[PDB]
Design a protein around this ligand. Structure first.
Ligand SMILES: CCCCCCCCCCCCCCCCCC(=O)OC[C@H](COP(=O)([O-])OCC(O)COP(=O)([O-])OC[C@@H](COC(=O)CCCCCCCCCCCCCCCCC)OC(=O)CCCCCCCCCCCCCCCCC)OC(=O)CCCCCCCCCCCCCCCCC
Ligand SMILES: CCCCCCCCCCCCCCCCCC(=O)OC[C@H](COP(=O)([O-])OCC(O)COP(=O)([O-])OC[C@@H](COC(=O)CCCCCCCCCCCCCCCCC)OC(=O)CCCCCCCCCCCCCCCCC)OC(=O)CCCCCCCCCCCCCCCCC
Ligand SMILES: CC(C)=CCC/C(C)=C/CC/C(C)=C/CC/C(C)=C/CC/C(C)=C/CC/C(C)=C/CC/C(C)=C/CC/C(C)=C/CC/C(C)=C/CC1=C(C)C(=O)c2ccccc2C1=O
Ligand SMILES: CCCCCCCCCCCCCCCC(=O)O[C@H](COC(=O)CCCCCCC[C@@H](C)CCCCCCCCC)COP(=O)(O)O[C@H]1[C@H](O)[C@H](O)[C@H](O)[C@@H](O)[C@@H]1O
Ligand SMILES: CCCCCCCCCCCCCCCC(=O)O[C@H](COC(=O)CCCCCCC[C@@H](C)CCCCCCCCC)COP(=O)(O)O[C@H]1[C@H](O)[C@H](O)[C@H](O)[C@@H](O)[C@@H]1O
Ligand code: HEC
Ligand code: HEC
Ligand SMILES: CCCCCCCCCCCCCCCC(=O)OC[C@H](C)OC(=O)CCCCCCCC[C@@H](C)CCCCCCCC
Ligand SMILES: CCc1nc2ccc(Cl)cn2c1C(=O)NCc1ccc(N2CCC(c3ccc(OC(F)(F)F)cc3)CC2)cc1
Ligand SMILES: CCc1nc2ccc(Cl)cn2c1C(=O)NCc1ccc(N2CCC(c3ccc(OC(F)(F)F)cc3)CC2)cc1
Ligand code: FES
Lengths: 267, 163, 223, 216, 216, 54, 53
């Protein structure tokens, strides 16, 4: 029910909202309308085989680059742009890396035992009519959901056509990703740093970038908590409209305050 | 919610009492109870129809004078009964939540509020188009039947809409 | 009963005449009319303690009952005599039936809950937020009779599920599902409330991330 | 932006008219039918009911007969608990389908529920013995109800829908049919034979009830 | 290796006995219902048929009566097409359920198919008018069949299974019950009243048929 | 092999003639024809019974 | 039909013929008797991801 309504909102509604091919993309993804009988098998294929494979290939590339673009380092006593100060792989680094994998696995096992995650049995089978009040996705999509909630219901109606407000979030993601994927190039275009940098920089030593990152984290947190504005209002007694408007004013004000504070804090 | 048999039963106006909301579905005479194999698949289609669910809300008589209607939907209400699609006009989540004494159809996916008294138009949240109102009336034997189809598409909006 | 009505009138004349007229017609912009609300409405509203409301705000909250069971019955009988309406269910003895209100079927009760109750409360009966300062409270505390009467009378921003929408059988079924969900232990460890994604993500970012980062700080160095 | 179409237009509206659905062309290619039978006539099907009314309109009973497998199946439910006196009632098939208070097809005294165009509703060529115009008797005990059947198949659904609508007439007598043998009994005229009035059809006191058989 | 079982040339075997499955136990106790009704007796259900046998053992009719909703439903299908002459057979309900060729309960002439211990099978407290024991004419045309019912509920399923099994008897007379008025009609003795022989039960010529009502 | 309804039918000895073979299944009175939703799965279970066919 | 009878022969019969654990292996693989309702999804997992990987 929860994941089904999440599919309905995100995939169906947003894909259908996209102007030119939105309905076509929706019918291709679902092989028809939303309850299409080929959705879950397709998601299974994408989730157990395709996307994990792509992620594994990209992780292989990532680790290969880090291995051969030998890891960067923080400035220090004997540390320079032309050396790596630390511990050789075999004696020390391998042992501590394996021990860290063991302890991370232990933390995850302890959580899997003692903490309940996605108790689907409480969540009846998905039906288009049944609903729940919470209706959030996992925390990594809560920013998406909060961006939906806080964006003020702005739609446009061209000649015999509709551009639903959902479209906005898609553009949002674009920009977000378009800014995340491309950020180092914007940094080097603005700052002009085109030098081979091997010594890391303490965040305090880059007040502008530290402020920008704090601003981005503030916006992400605001959106994530906006997705939880339903639960926040329920538990912390704040009117739902008040939380929605706190988020609406915040997604413009809180980033500015956080940027200013983080800049002054770094300095 | 009976386990399989007769999941859908005809409905009567007296059943809904002032300030009461009930989810209703488009049950045909042919789509009989789920006793047989031919049925129980038509009924499954009705249940799984994304746009099939509707909410019928009985506006309190004292609040009747406050109702504001929609052009072309002035007679859609049968007396004090109003049928509005449950599917949100924003991204197509069900708008199940109903608040009486304030007449607010609330969608919890993105916390969107439509005014039930005035035609179900969004008065808060992301939604910008009113919920589609289903024409309703009572047929022979006094059972509530749709008085026709939605005058407009009912799910969430898309490119080829409002023409 | 004559003495019951007398006691109900005595209690009413000095607890709620300010909100509701002495003739039970609501005072303008203070309280609504109690004519026709019924004994079920009075029982649910006062047993939950909501009625000595003591303020006009977005949502009257639940609070410790201001009257005891006998006084609850007296008030409810008074209101029933005045206007006449829904009556709280009772068993053979005469007390407010609570055990008898647990319907046998739960899967059907579960479907009924998800279609009707979960809309605003939760998948598993937890609370939910509403339009402006309102919310749907958690169902854990409400006893079977209170859940039944809440369905039978929509207190405020609750749809009123008459006996015809949800016949006593369906109401008992929903009560059974509510109680089962409320008292059922969360299989798979401490159930973080009932909301999944939000408590789950919060618990990740606190427990798992603090643990992982602390272990990294322990294993790693600082420089 | 706002969507193009909204607002009431200050038009009140009208209450929806009672829905009157049409047959199903899309689902049904033709018109579905109910009871089936030979029905060698204009058409009666395998379902035909009747209602027995009293002199003041009170429901005396409710008869119903229909053809199933070439032999008409019939039954009459009781319409009132104390409608029938604790005695015997003579049930007969009447040629007249009108359950008037008092109608007389011939020239003479009009008896209550005597609109029948003669005695018993026999076949067109049958005018002698008690043909299909005769039906099972209506014996009533202190209970005052009617539930009993017989075997009278001289007429069928094909002959039931004749030129004149048939009916069921409930009398207030038993079933003897001149049981007094000519050897021992005698008539008013002294002849050992029976009276033709009682032989044409079951004759009794004032008619107990009259119910139209035309799918009443 | 070879499997241990192997051949058996000896004991050629026996033809399998006809299978007779046991009733489904409490686990699959669910089964088709035999009928529901008031059943104010030792038990008869909502289904009870009867077979009308002639003097030569050839079926003439097949009566049936069963409680449905407190009012008995009955229908007597014809057993043969040429069994019934083109006329009326005096229907009656006999207290005696033995449709013997010739047997009379009292000391006297034993009419064919006249095993009834008296006239009509009335109620236990009924001994006067023509109670549910009395029945009217069963009509057969040139086709020779009987299918038609009436309303006569002086009894019920509770009284159907009396101490002595009842039966359905087909006489050779119509249903009149002294239709000749006492004002002008007269009997052998001149008394304006009717004969007790024709009043107690439908009296006619030799019995047309007799069929036991006990699930015949 | 009727499509869904009454897939299994009672059988009588004279149906199979000398030198004839017939695949038969263990059909019960309870496992009525396949119209009902309750049925159509008892019958499906009989059909899918790996050891059922004879 | 062809592939189903192939499964029936090989995966079911041979697996359940193995002396010590034949039936146990058969029930672990099929989650029950031969036509077990978990076979094809498990083969799909083995055939699109696991064995290809
Ligand atoms: C998947 C996720 C899981 C994790 C996998 C990723 C891990 C990455 C860590 C990198 C370590 C690594 O590459 O190790 C190989 C590495 C090879 O590199 P090298 O030897 O240093 O060569 C000199 C440089 O390559 C010379 O190059 P350079 O440093 O001068 O600059 C060139 C460099 C430029 O840097 C890059 O661009 C690297 C990034 C490459 C992008 C894509 C690579 C992977 C993407 C595919 C995704 C995988 C899925 O390109 C490379 O070197 C790439 C090498 C390709 C290996 C990529 C590893 C993956 O080390 C070994 O040779 C050790 C293996 C010893 C042999 C086995 C010992 C016993 C033999 C018995 C065998 C069987 C016994 C039976 C009995
Ligand atoms: C949640 C609350 C749980 C109850 C525990 C409350 C006690 C918290 C004491 C920490 C407060 C002191 C502090 O701020 O600095 C500690 C530590 C070092 O501070 P520092 O002085 O600036 O660094 C120089 C040290 O010499 C750095 O030198 P080092 O790295 O070698 O120091 C490591 C020694 C000292 O450093 C520590 O790590 C002390 C932490 C010991 C408390 C954790 C064990 C008790 C709770 C286990 C869960 C049951 O490490 C150990 O002996 C083994 C500790 C393994 C770390 C496990 C922490 C994650 C488990 C707790 C989260 C799960 C909550 C489930 C409920 O930084 C941390 O924040 C440790 C993680 C904080 C854990 C509580 C999470 C809230
Ligand atoms: C769009 C948007 C963010 C709108 C505003 C909504 C919002 C976040 C409002 C603030 C919520 C708060 C802090 C309410 C308390 C009253 C209040 C506002 C006081 C003044 C605030 C202020 C600046 C005080 C000065 C000191 C100070 C910083 C106090 C903060 C107090 C708090 C709450 C600190 C901890 C922060 C915190 C954990 C907030 C809740 C975050 C979430 C999403 C928790 C999710 C969660 C829930 C909802 C469970 O039910 C649960 C049940 C069982 C196990 C786990 C959980 C769980 O993790
Ligand atoms: C990380 C998050 C940080 C927050 C970031 C954002 C900061 C910007 C704050 C912007 C504040 C904007 C407030 C306005 C909001 C608004 O416009 O809505 C009003 C309700 O005003 C209010 O409550 C005032 C609320 C102001 C409180 C903001 C306080 C800051 C908090 C949130 C900071 C703590 C953060 C802790 C984070 C924890 C760590 C995170 C890792 C009315 O609503 P309503 O309720 O419907 O009232 C109806 C009438 O309308 C109608 O007429 C009348 O008739 C009535 O019917 C009435 O019902
Ligand atoms: C490495 C992970 C270690 C995790 C620890 C594991 C602990 C195991 C606990 C014991 C076994 C599992 C219990 C399952 C049974 C169970 O679920 O536990 C409830 C409790 O639940 C609560 O209330 C909360 C009580 C407060 C104590 C527990 C708090 C633990 C948190 C702090 C750990 C997670 C981290 C979160 C940090 C978030 C902070 C952010 C800064 C208890 O019943 P109850 O109290 O009555 O719940 C009400 C129903 O009754 C009623 O209907 C219902 O309607 C409700 O009202 C319900 O509350
Ligand atoms: C302060 C104003 C009070 C007082 C002291 C009481 N009531 Fe009444 N009441 C009040 C409000 C604002 C409302 C509507 C919203 C809400 O209930 O919180 C009500 C409603 C009721 C009802 C519900 C009727 C129904 O659901 O149909 C009942 C049954 C009721 N009130 C009764 C009641 C009793 C018995 C009181 C003394 C114990 C009482 N109220 C006091 C406002 C106020
Ligand atoms: C949003 C519409 C809405 C729906 C639909 C709804 N509820 Fe509620 N519910 C509420 C609100 C609002 C309250 C607060 C009552 C009050 O304040 O007096 C409430 C209160 C309750 C309570 C009182 C619990 C307590 O502790 O006070 C129970 C029990 C309950 N609901 C159960 C149900 C059940 C069962 C259903 C399905 C028949 C249902 N609800 C459907 C909104 C709703
Ligand atoms: C997601 C991407 C969003 C892209 C929208 C593309 C809009 C094209 C169609 C606009 C239209 O003609 O429809 C009629 C309109 C509803 O009514 C009006 O004409 C009055 C409009 C007053 C306010 C205008 C503000 C527009 C700002 C945008 C151009 C900025 C987008 C970034
Ligand atoms: C909606 C918010 C939400 N509400 C709830 C309520 C309850 C629950 Cl449980 C969960 N939620 C969620 C939720 O989880 N949202 C996650 C999400 C959102 C959007 C997408 N999008 C992929 C790209 C599509 C797209 C865009 C551009 C394209 O053009 C291209 F790229 F060029 F081809 C093609 C496709 C739009 C949908 C995925 C996940
Ligand atoms: C059977 C022949 C056949 N007839 C038809 C008819 C029609 C059609 Cl279409 C196809 N066929 C086929 C067919 O295709 N046969 C392929 C086949 C054969 C055997 C196995 N086996 C692997 C080992 C398992 C095993 C045994 C021991 C083990 O022990 C260990 F290793 F130590 F763990 C582990 C696994 C048993 C099954 C698979 C496929
Ligand atoms: S899903 Fe309904 S408001 Fe967006």
């Amino acid at each position: 029910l929860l994941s089904g309504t999440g599919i309905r909102a995100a995939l169906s509604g947003i894909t259908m909202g996209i102007p030119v091919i939105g309905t076509w993309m929706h019918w291709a993804l679902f092989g028809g309308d939303f309850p299409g009988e080929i959705l879950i098998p397709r998601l299974y294929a994408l989730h157990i085989l395709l996307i994990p494979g792509i992620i594994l290939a990209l992780i292989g590339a990532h680790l290969a680059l880090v291995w051969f673009q030998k890891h960067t380092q923080f400035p220090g006593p004997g540390r320079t742009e032309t050396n790596v100060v630390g511990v050789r792989v075999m004696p020390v680094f391998a042992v501590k890396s394996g021990a860290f994998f063991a302890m991370i696995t232990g933390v995850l096992g302890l959580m899997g035992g003692l903490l309940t995650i996605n108790p689907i049995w409480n969540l009846g089978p998905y039906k288009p009519s049944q609903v729940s009040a919470g209706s959030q996705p996992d925390f990594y999509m809560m920013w998406t959901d909060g961006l939906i909630r806080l964006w003020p219901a702005w739609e446009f109606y061209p000649f015999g056509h509709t551009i639903p407000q959902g479209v906005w979030v898609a553009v949002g993601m674009g920009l977000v990703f378009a800014l995340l994927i491309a950020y180092p190039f914007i940094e080097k275009k603005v700052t002009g740093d085109d030098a081979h940098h091997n010594l890391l920089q303490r965040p305090r030593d880059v007040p502008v970038r530290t402020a920008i990152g704090s601003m981005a984290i503030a916006l992400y947190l605001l959106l994530t908590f906006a997705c939880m504005n339903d639960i926040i209002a329920l538990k912390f007694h704040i009117s739902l409209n008040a939380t929605t408007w706190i988020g609406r004013i915040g997604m413009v004000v809180l980033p500015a305050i956080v940027y200013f504070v983080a800049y002054r804090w770094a300095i | 919610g009976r386990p399989g048999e007769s999941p859908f039963v005809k409905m009567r106006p007296e059943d809904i009492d002032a300030g009461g909301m009930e989810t209703v579905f488009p049950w045909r005479e042919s789509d009989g109870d789920g006793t047989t194999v031919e049925s129980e698949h038509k009924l499954t289609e009705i249940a799984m129809g994304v746009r099939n669910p509707v909410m019928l809300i009985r506006i309190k008589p004292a609040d009747m004078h406050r109702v504001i209607k929609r052009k072309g939907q002035e007679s859609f209400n049968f007396g004090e009964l109003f049928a509005y699609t449950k599917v949100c006009s924003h991204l197509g989540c069900p708008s199940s939540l109903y608040e009486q004494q304030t007449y607010r159809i609330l969608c919890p996916c993105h916390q969107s509020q439509f005014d039930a008294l005035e035609f179900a138009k969004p008065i808060f949240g992301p939604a910008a188009r009113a919920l589609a109102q289903l024409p309703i009336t009572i047929d022979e034997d006094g059972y509530l039947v749709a008085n026709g189809d939605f005058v407009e598409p009912v799910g969430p909006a898309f490119w080829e809409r409002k023409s | 009963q004559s003495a019951l009505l007398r006691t109900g009138k005595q209690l009413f004349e000095t607890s709620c005449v300010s909100c509701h007229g002495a003739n039970l017609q609501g005072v303008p912009d203070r309280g609504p009319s109690l004519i026709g609300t019924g004994e079920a409405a009075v029982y649910f509203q006062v047993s939950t303690g909501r009625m000595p409301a003591m303020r006009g705000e977005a949502q009257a909250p639940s609070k410790p009952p201001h009257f005891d069971e006998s006084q609850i019955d007296a008030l409810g009988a008074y209101v029933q005599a005045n206007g006449g309406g829904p009556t709280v269910p009772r068993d053979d003895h005469g007390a407010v039936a609570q055990e008898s209100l647990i319907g046998g079927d739960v899967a059907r009760g579960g479907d009924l809950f998800r279609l009707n109750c979960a809309s605003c409360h939760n998948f598993t009966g937890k609370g939910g937020a509403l339009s402006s300062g309102k919310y749907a409270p958690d169902l854990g505390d409400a006893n079977p009779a209170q859940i039944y009467t809440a369905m039978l009378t929509g207190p405020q921003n609750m749809p009123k599920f008459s006996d015809r929408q949800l016949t006593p059988d369906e109401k008992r079924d929903i009560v059974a599902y509510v109680r089962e969900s409320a008292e059922t232990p969360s299989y798979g460890g401490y159930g973080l409330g009932g909301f999944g994604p939000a408590p789950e993500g919060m618990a990740m970012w606190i427990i798992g991330m603090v643990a992982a980062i602390g272990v990294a700080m322990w294993i790693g160095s600082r420089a | 932006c706002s969507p193009p179409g909204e607002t009431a237009s200050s038009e009140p509206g009208t209450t929806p008219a009672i829905w009157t659905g049409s047959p199903s062309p899309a689902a049904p290619s033709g018109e579905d039918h109910g009871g089936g039978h030979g029905a060698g006539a204009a058409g009666a099907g395998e379902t035909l009911t009747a209602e027995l009314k009293t002199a003041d309109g009170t429901s005396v009973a409710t008869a119903d007969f229909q053809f199933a497998d070439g032999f008409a199946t019939v039954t009459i439910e009781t319409t009132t608990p104390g409608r029938l006196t604790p005695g015997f009632h003579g049930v007969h098939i009447h040629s007249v389908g009108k359950c008037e208070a008092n109608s007389v097809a011939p020239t003479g005294g009009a008896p209550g529920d005597f609109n029948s165009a003669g005695g018993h509703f026999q076949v067109s060529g049958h005018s002698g013995h008690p043909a299909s115009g005769d039906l099972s008797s209506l014996q009533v005990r202190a209970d005052g109800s009617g539930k009993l059947v017989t075997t009278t198949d001289a007429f069928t659904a094909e002959d039931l829908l004749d030129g004149a609508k048939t009916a069921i007439i409930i009398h207030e007598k038993a079933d003897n049919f001149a049981n007094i043998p000519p050897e021992r009994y005698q008539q008013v005229n002294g002849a050992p034979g029976p009276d033709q009035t009682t032989m044409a059809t079951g004759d009794a006191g004032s008619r107990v009830a009259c119910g139209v058989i035309s799918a009443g």
